[PDB]
Amino acid sequence: ATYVETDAAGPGGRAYVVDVPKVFRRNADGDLIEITSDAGRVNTNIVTATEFLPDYYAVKENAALVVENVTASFPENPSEAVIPSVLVNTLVGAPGETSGGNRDPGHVIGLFSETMIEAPCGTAFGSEFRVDPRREHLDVYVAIKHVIGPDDQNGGTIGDYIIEQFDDMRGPVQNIGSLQQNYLDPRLVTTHLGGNVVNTQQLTQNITLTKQQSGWFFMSQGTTEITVTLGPDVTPGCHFHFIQGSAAKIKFAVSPDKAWYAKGNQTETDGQFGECTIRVYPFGGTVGTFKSAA
Amino acid sequence: ATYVETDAAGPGGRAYVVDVPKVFRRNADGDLIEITSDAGRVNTNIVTATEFLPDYYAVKENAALVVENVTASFPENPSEAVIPSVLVNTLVGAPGETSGGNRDPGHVIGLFSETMIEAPCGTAFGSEFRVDPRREHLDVYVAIKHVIGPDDQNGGTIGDYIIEQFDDMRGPVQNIGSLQQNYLDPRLVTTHLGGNVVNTQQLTQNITLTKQQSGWFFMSQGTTEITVTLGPDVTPGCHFHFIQGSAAKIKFAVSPDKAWYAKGNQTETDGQFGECTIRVYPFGGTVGTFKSAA
Amino acid sequence: ATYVETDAAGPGGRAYVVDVPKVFRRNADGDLIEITSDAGRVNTNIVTATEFLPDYYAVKENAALVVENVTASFPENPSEAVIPSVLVNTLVGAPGETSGGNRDPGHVIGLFSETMIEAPCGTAFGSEFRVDPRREHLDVYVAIKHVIGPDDQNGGTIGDYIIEQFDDMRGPVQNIGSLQQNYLDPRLVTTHLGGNVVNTQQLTQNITLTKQQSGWFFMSQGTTEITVTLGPDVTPGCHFHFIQGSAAKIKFAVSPDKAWYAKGNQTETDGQFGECTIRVYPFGGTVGTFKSAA
Incomplete structure (x- = not known):
């Protein structure tokens, strides 16, 4: 110096x-x-x-x-440059260097948002995205965009990719009163071009259906009859599917605020390999579509 | 120095x-x-x-x-710690004291993102998650990863948890053109394990089906004839279901740009409990599966 | 110095x-x-x-x-004020002036996350949300919200409001191992009131089913028979819908790991306008609900 x-x-x-x-x-x-x-x-x-x-x-x-970031172009030349407000550039390993890295026990986080609550609080928000079209027209707005660089410049290989990952903590966590995922505006359209998977389970004892049991597949396995009772918490709109793979019969019951609706007033499956679709409609309308055993 | x-x-x-x-x-x-x-x-x-x-x-x-946040380590001793580029903490209530809190009118927000519009804007991004595997191999990538503290270390309770909430603004906003949620890559493999709810409607008059009503379950009610007309906007791949719970007949009409397809060119239902499933397909192929009344 | x-x-x-x-x-x-x-x-x-x-x-x-944000409040008078931690306010154009703008090629990003890989890595997180109710009870928590300013305050218009956008990069990107979206806690309940759209295609040659193809609709076109083989990658909990669109029959094949299962062991559709619902059940049970050609 x-x-x-x-x-x-x-x-x-x-x-x-x-x-x-x-x-x-x-x-x-x-x-x-x-x-x-x-x-x-x-x-x-x-x-x-x-x-x-x-x-x-x-x-x-x-x-x-x-x-806050403010962009002001000329009316003659509205610019086309990308203008981010906050740029968080997580980098692992120095460029042009082949030293080190991070192993499985640890992980790198692009943005860590932790909520620390220890006092009686009403509601807490982990994020928020607001758009205020005061004066002009915006052609398209996207809340969350996912981009992956082309392989012509990035020679690396990504073994696994996850858009969104939610674990299970039935053991470690019991204090959650109820966890859900709400979309109260049906204007949106889900253009899901990929596959899907639903839960399945085998029934052997009498159960009480709730909102969690919406849409899984139930296998009546055993010899004694299995009774399914539709709880009052079940809301119109869901549907369940039942198929009998054993000799045991399946009985069905509904809450007092639901009135049973069916073709022929059938309260049980006819036989083995008989399908039963239970659908809930407003003001407690339970409809059970039955298929013959043969 | x-x-x-x-x-x-x-x-x-x-x-x-x-x-x-x-x-x-x-x-x-x-x-x-x-x-x-x-x-x-x-x-x-x-x-x-x-x-x-x-x-x-x-x-x-x-x-x-x-x-920026660069993690450097020796080649023979890769790191195993956790490296968050940005850490934001939302603490309510001073530790060691339960005094105070926040009620419904005030909500504590971990991260706030919002936009004002005052000039003609092409497109706006609420967020972006890029990844450039420039040189080496990455095992797993996660965009959003929700964590809930285990109860053994958390004596408190959470009454309600929402992974994502979108309210309905039928009244307050009407300047929005379309609401979309696009997944343009069919290579995605969505895996679900919860429940699903489908919007249900009771039909009583002439209806022109659009993108919003796709995937719903429709109910035929009344006595007057009910006609379902598929407009030009209905893109191929959508599915609709109809059930005739009364004696009111159901007619089906298609736009001139596409041809109607069914079993035996049956352009109407047969009677009560005659369900019709409409599936559109490219080259104007609108097929309709008709279920017998009995 | x-x-x-x-x-x-x-x-x-x-x-x-x-x-x-x-x-x-x-x-x-x-x-x-x-x-x-x-x-x-x-x-x-x-x-x-x-x-x-x-x-x-x-x-x-x-x-x-x-x-770090600490919203300590008095116990007898808890607060009712919205208190964020990090506030980002991206805006285009000064208030009261319409000059300039930013056309479609350019865009503004509320939060531009990034991740560059130059050394071997084990795990990378785009973001992470955590809740830690150590002592007291929390009523409601929502990880991410979407709020749009009501029209009584905003006079402009919005073209498209995309909740989530994911493009297709089949050409530029081919080094990705897989694309997934996992929910391994079954306690979650989802309420999607909007329209749902899936992928449909018409078969032309013998194909092998994968996880990406689950929940699709297929039609057979032509005269030569088409063989569909369930690959070893198929797991329990999936479902496939098949309809014979032409005179060509669709033969069904199963990998040695999985066991074929059908009513009467019907391995192909009898004729046109036949229906098959193939569902995979625990212990490799590939059970197919069948509906005849008529």
Whole structure:
């Protein structure tokens, strides 16, 4: 780190020529930040309790970190450049280097959002996506977009890909009152071009159907009769399928608020290999479509 | 000053360190210009975008906040820790105290994303999840991965959990053209294990089927003749189901751009409980499977 | 350069000042790179990860950016105010001005996540949402929402509002091992009121069924018989729908691992307008519900 006379600063310029690729790390209130082109790292904030002010300025003044990006092109030349607001670039391994990596026990996270709740709270939001078309027309908006780079530039191989992955914690977690997934606006259309898989189970004891049992396949296996009771929590719209693979018969019952509706008033399957489709319609309309054993 | 083996510049080290959080540089005029930077909790950027350039180095030149996190390890000792590029924590209630909380009117949000529109905009992205396997092999990729704390370490309870909620805004918004959820790659293998609910409708008058009503279960009610007309918008591949629960007949009509197809050119139902399943197919092939009344 | 005491770094502050307008760094190749400050926060970090420590305090040490929000409120008067943690406000055009814009080739991204791979890796997460109810009870939690400003506040229009978009990259991308979307907790209940669209195709030669083809509709065209073989990859819980669209019969074959199962061991459709519903059940039970040609 000296002042030298070099041509890189001009025909006869002078410069400070610190001679290490990892130039000044700088010391913040405890940590070496990075090259002297960065800012503070750890941010904390405490908000003051107030009333409901559903305004953008109000939530801005309550926010802990505010990032805003404004683009202003000319009317003659509306630009076509990609303008992200927040760019999080997770990188593993230095470019041009074949050193190290991360193993299975650990994992790298592009963005970790953790909810820390220990006080009585009404609702908590993990994310939110709002669009405000104040003045103009937007041709198309997408909340979540998935892009994978073409193989002509990326020679790597991805063994497995998951769009969305949800584990099971029936043992470790019991305090969840109810977990669901709601789409209250039927305007959307699901253009699912792939396959699908549904749950299946074999019945041997009498069961009470709820909203979770919507749509699986039931196998009546055993010798004693198996009774299925449609609980009051079952909502119109779901459907269940039953097929008998054994000699045991299948009995059906409904909640008092549901009135049985069937062709011929049949309350059980006719025989083995007989199909039974149970469908629920508004104001408690239970319809059981039966198929002959033969 | 001085050069140190900090180990914060990789496994090797050998970086240059300055022991104060602010450094400066004297320009030609004689006044100091800061080399470093430190912004508060509010950040603002204005960009005069040039022509389209899909280069990551060019892309980061327009972002208002760029975050990188590089993981480096020895080739013989790959890392096994967890490396989140960005960590955001939403804490309610000071630890060691249960005082206070948030009711229904106020909702704590881990991450807020929103947009204002004031100029003609082509398209807008609420998020984007890219991946570039530039050189090496990656085993598993996950876009969104939901985690619930185990109850052995969590004495509290969660009454309701929603992995995704989309409300209905029939009244408040009417400027939206279409609502879509596209999966343009049939190579996707969706795996489900929960339940499903299908919207159900009771038909009583003339109806022109569109994209929104696809996949539903329709009920024939009343005595007057009910006609279902398939408009041009109905793309191939959609499926519809109809059940005649009364004596009202059901007629089927197709747009002139496609030809109706059924069993024996039967363009109507046969009677009560005569179910018709309509499946559209390319080249204008609209097939209808008709079920006998008895 | 020497540390000095100046007011330019705050009232009664100290700094590290270089007395030359140009400061240079020697990179790994010996070239000189000028050190300069751009616009926007460039928060960056490099981590030499230790062993696996799955603790919040431990993991927070490896984050390039940490945001902490504590909404402590009084016990007798809990708050009812919306309090986000990270607020992102991307907008186009200043309020009150219609000048300029951004056409379709360009776009704005609310949060541009990224992931570059240069070294072998085990697991990568695009994002992660976690809830930790240590002490108290939470009423409702929703991971991700979708809120659109009501028209009484927004005067513009939206063309398309895509909840989730996934394009097709068969050409550019062929190094992907597989594409999946797994839900391995059966307790989940979904309420999809919108339309559902699946993939349909017409057979022309002998084919082998895969997981991607589950839940599709097929028709046989021509005169030569077409053989459909269930591949070894087929697992229990799938379903396939087949209809003979022409005079050519469709023969059914099963891999040695799976066992064929049908009413009367009917391995092919009798004639045109026949129906088959092939469902795979535990222990390799490939059971096919059959409907005759008529």
